Design an enzyme around this catalytic site. Structure first.
Site, PDB file in Angstrom:
ATOM      1  N   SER A  26      -6.621  14.538 -13.084  1.00 37.03           N
ATOM      2  CA  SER A  26      -6.177  13.349 -13.529  1.00 37.03           C
ATOM      3  C   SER A  26      -7.205  13.087 -15.540  1.00 37.03           C
ATOM      4  O   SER A  26      -8.107  13.686 -14.922  1.00 37.03           O
ATOM      5  CB  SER A  26      -6.749  12.352 -12.394  1.00 37.03           C
ATOM      6  OG  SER A  26      -6.580  11.027 -13.379  1.00 37.03           O
ATOM      7  N   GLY A  28      -7.333  10.138 -15.498  1.00 35.09           N
ATOM      8  CA  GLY A  28      -7.841   8.553 -15.629  1.00 35.09           C
ATOM      9  C   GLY A  28      -9.674   8.417 -14.955  1.00 35.09           C
ATOM     10  O   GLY A  28      -9.526  10.289 -15.304  1.00 35.09           O
ATOM     11  N   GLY A  30     -10.090   7.103 -11.201  1.00 33.39           N
ATOM     12  CA  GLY A  30      -9.797   7.671  -9.592  1.00 33.39           C
ATOM     13  C   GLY A  30     -10.366   8.093  -9.298  1.00 33.39           C
ATOM     14  O   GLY A  30     -10.645   8.779  -9.050  1.00 33.39           O
ATOM     15  N   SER A  31     -10.949   7.609  -7.423  1.00 33.62           N
ATOM     16  CA  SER A  31     -11.995   7.733  -7.105  1.00 33.62           C
ATOM     17  C   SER A  31     -10.819   8.857  -5.548  1.00 33.62           C
ATOM     18  O   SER A  31     -10.856   8.726  -4.012  1.00 33.62           O
ATOM     19  CB  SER A  31     -12.630   7.175  -6.346  1.00 33.62           C
ATOM     20  OG  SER A  31     -13.028   6.621  -7.435  1.00 33.62           O
ATOM     21  N   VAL A  32      -9.453   9.399  -5.994  1.00 32.37           N
ATOM     22  CA  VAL A  32      -9.325  10.586  -5.320  1.00 32.37           C
ATOM     23  C   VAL A  32      -9.470  11.970  -5.229  1.00 32.37           C
ATOM     24  O   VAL A  32      -8.752  12.731  -6.107  1.00 32.37           O
ATOM     25  CB  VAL A  32      -6.945   9.854  -5.647  1.00 32.37           C
ATOM     26  CG1 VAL A  32      -6.555  10.809  -3.722  1.00 32.37           C
ATOM     27  CG2 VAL A  32      -7.032   8.536  -5.229  1.00 32.37           C
ATOM     28  N   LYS A  47      -8.389   9.056  -0.571  1.00 28.99           N
ATOM     29  CA  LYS A  47      -8.846   8.585  -1.533  1.00 28.99           C
ATOM     30  C   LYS A  47     -10.303   7.384  -0.943  1.00 28.99           C
ATOM     31  O   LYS A  47     -10.399   6.924   0.233  1.00 28.99           O
ATOM     32  CB  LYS A  47      -8.223   7.645  -1.760  1.00 28.99           C
ATOM     33  CG  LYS A  47      -8.042   6.253  -2.833  1.00 28.99           C
ATOM     34  CD  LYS A  47      -6.771   5.354  -2.747  1.00 28.99           C
ATOM     35  CE  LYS A  47      -6.865   4.622  -3.809  1.00 28.99           C
ATOM     36  NZ  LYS A  47      -5.675   3.392  -4.171  1.00 28.99           N
ATOM     37  N   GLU A 101      -0.536  11.094   2.193  1.00 24.03           N
ATOM     38  CA  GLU A 101       0.031  12.335   2.247  1.00 24.03           C
ATOM     39  C   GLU A 101      -0.084  13.107   1.180  1.00 24.03           C
ATOM     40  O   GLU A 101      -0.641  11.661   0.012  1.00 24.03           O
ATOM     41  CB  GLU A 101       1.297  11.512   2.472  1.00 24.03           C
ATOM     42  CG  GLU A 101       2.144  11.299   3.272  1.00 24.03           C
ATOM     43  CD  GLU A 101       3.225  11.173   3.251  1.00 24.03           C
ATOM     44  OE1 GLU A 101       4.040  10.470   3.034  1.00 24.03           O
ATOM     45  OE2 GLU A 101       4.022  12.144   4.417  1.00 24.03           O
ATOM     46  N   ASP A 108       2.927  13.067 -11.436  1.00 29.44           N
ATOM     47  CA  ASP A 108       3.461  11.149 -11.736  1.00 29.44           C
ATOM     48  C   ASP A 108       4.754  11.411 -12.758  1.00 29.44           C
ATOM     49  O   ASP A 108       4.851  11.962 -13.818  1.00 29.44           O
ATOM     50  CB  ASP A 108       2.317  10.297 -11.439  1.00 29.44           C
ATOM     51  CG  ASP A 108       1.414  10.428 -13.544  1.00 29.44           C
ATOM     52  OD1 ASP A 108       2.434  10.132 -14.074  1.00 29.44           O
ATOM     53  OD2 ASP A 108       0.326  10.339 -12.755  1.00 29.44           O
ATOM     54  N   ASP A 147       1.885  -4.217  -8.450  1.00 22.78           N
ATOM     55  CA  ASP A 147       1.594  -3.374  -9.766  1.00 22.78           C
ATOM     56  C   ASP A 147       3.341  -2.118  -9.781  1.00 22.78           C
ATOM     57  O   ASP A 147       2.309  -0.452 -10.309  1.00 22.78           O
ATOM     58  CB  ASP A 147       0.973  -2.819 -10.030  1.00 22.78           C
ATOM     59  CG  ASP A 147       0.036  -1.869 -10.860  1.00 22.78           C
ATOM     60  OD1 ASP A 147      -0.045  -2.190 -11.855  1.00 22.78           O
ATOM     61  OD2 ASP A 147      -1.101  -1.262 -10.272  1.00 22.78           O
TER      62      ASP A 147
END
Length: 285
Positions: A26, A28, A30-32, A47, A101, A108, A147
Site C-alpha cells: 500500500s 496509503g 490502512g491498518s490491514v 484489519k 478474504e 485494486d 464509498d
C-alpha cells in the site's frame, strides 16, 4: 507472528489460529495486514479498527455492540458475491479485529488503471457490470456502501472477478433522505454539495457514473465543487457515444433524472458482457 487475543497477551510469565505478517502492500495508511488461517493455509486480510475512532456503532442479530462496519459486513457476507467476505472478527480492549478474504494474486482497480491507463470498453463493460451486480447484492442485504470508487474494488486477477471492500463509511439502507456523508469532496454527488441531502440508491448511481468515466478515461471527471454542480462532462479520451450517453445519464444533476439499476443494465452500452473467466483470459492473463 501469532495473532493472539491481546497485543500484550505475552506480557507476563502467565500465558482458528492465524499467522500475521506485514502491512499489505500500500501507498496509503490502512491498518490491514497479510495473514494466514493456520488450519488450511487460507490467505486472509487482518484489519484493525480503533475503538476511539469509530463514529458509527450498531448491533448484530445477537443484540451485541460492534462497529457498524461489522454489522454491514455480516449482512453482505451471506453466500457468494462480488464482496470481500468477513470470515471472523473479535473484540480487544481498545479495538476490533476483522478477518477478511484475501484473493491471490490481487490488485485494486486504482493501481490497475495507473498501470494500464484508460481501459478498453469491453474490459470496462465486464468490470462495471460486476460492480453493478455487487452493489445490487449489498442493497438486497439492506446495506448502502456510500464509498464506491476504484480504490475500494479488488481485482481477483486469476478469476477475472471484482470484489468491493471497505464498508467503514456505509449505512443501513433506507429509502428516506440521508443528512450525513463521510466521503471526499471529488466524490460528493451534487445534491450533497448544494443541500447536504441525498437518497442512497440515486447517490450510488452518481458514484457509478464517476467510476465508469474513471475506467474509460483513466481518471475521475471532476476535481472542484463547481464542476460537480455545473452539469458539464468533458471527455479527454475517445469514448463511444453509447458509453458517453450512459455516463451522462448516471451523472444527471437531479437525482430523479438518474437511471434505475434496471435502466443502467438494459442500456445499449451494457449488452454482450463477457464472463469473468473470459475477462481474465482476454484482459488479465
Amino acid at each position: 507472528s501469532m495473532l493472539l487475543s491481546k497485543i500484550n497477551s505475552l506480557a507476563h510469565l502467565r500465558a482458528s489460529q492465524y499467522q500475521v505478517g506485514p502491512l499489505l502492500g500500500s501507498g496509503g495508511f490502512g491498518s490491514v495486514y497479510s495473514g494466514i488461517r493456520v488450519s488450511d493455509n487460507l490467505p486472509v486480510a487482518i484489519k484493525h479498527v480503533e475503538k476511539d475512532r469509530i463514529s458509527d456503532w450498531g448491533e448484530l442479530p445477537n443484540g451485541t455492540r460492534v462497529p457498524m462496519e461489522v454489522v454491514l459486513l455480516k449482512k453482505v457476507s451471506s453466500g457468494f458475491s462480488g464482496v470481500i467476505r468477513l470470515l471472523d472478527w473479535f473484540e480487544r480492549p481498545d479495538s476490533f479485529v476483522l478477518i477478511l478474504e484475501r484473493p491471490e494474486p490481487v490488485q485494486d482497480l486504482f493501481d490497475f488503471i495507473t498501470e494500464r491507463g484508460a481501459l478498453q470498453e469491453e474490459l470496462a463493460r465486464s468490470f462495471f457490470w460486476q460492480v453493478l451486480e455487487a452493489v445490487r447484492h449489498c442493497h438486497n442485504c439492506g446495506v448502502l456502501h456510500r464509498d464506491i470508487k476504484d480504490e475500494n474494488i479488488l481485482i481477483d486477477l486469476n478469476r477475472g472477478e471484482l470484489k468491493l471492500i471497505d464498508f467503514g463509511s456505509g449505512a443501513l439502507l433506507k429509502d428516506t433522505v440521508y443528512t450525513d456523508f463521510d466521503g471526499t469532496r471529488v466524490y460528493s454527488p451534487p445534491e450533497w454539495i448544494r443541500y447536504h441531502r441525498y437518497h442512497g440508491r440515486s447517490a450510488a448511481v452518481w458514484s457509478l457514473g464517476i467510476l465508469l468515466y474513471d475506467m474509460v478515461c483513466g481518471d475521475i471527471p471532476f476535481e472542484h465543487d463547481e464542476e460537480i454542480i455545473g452539469g458539464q462532462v468533458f471527455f479527454r479520451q475517445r469514448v463511444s457515444s453509447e458509453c458517453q450517453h450512459l455516463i451522462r445519464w448516471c451523472l444527471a444533476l437531479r437525482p430523479s433524472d438518474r437511471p434505475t439499476f434496471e435502466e443502467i443494465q438494459n442500456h445499449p452500452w451494457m449488452q454482450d458482457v463477457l464472463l469473468p473467466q473470459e475477462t481474465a483470459e482476454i484482459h488479465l492473463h
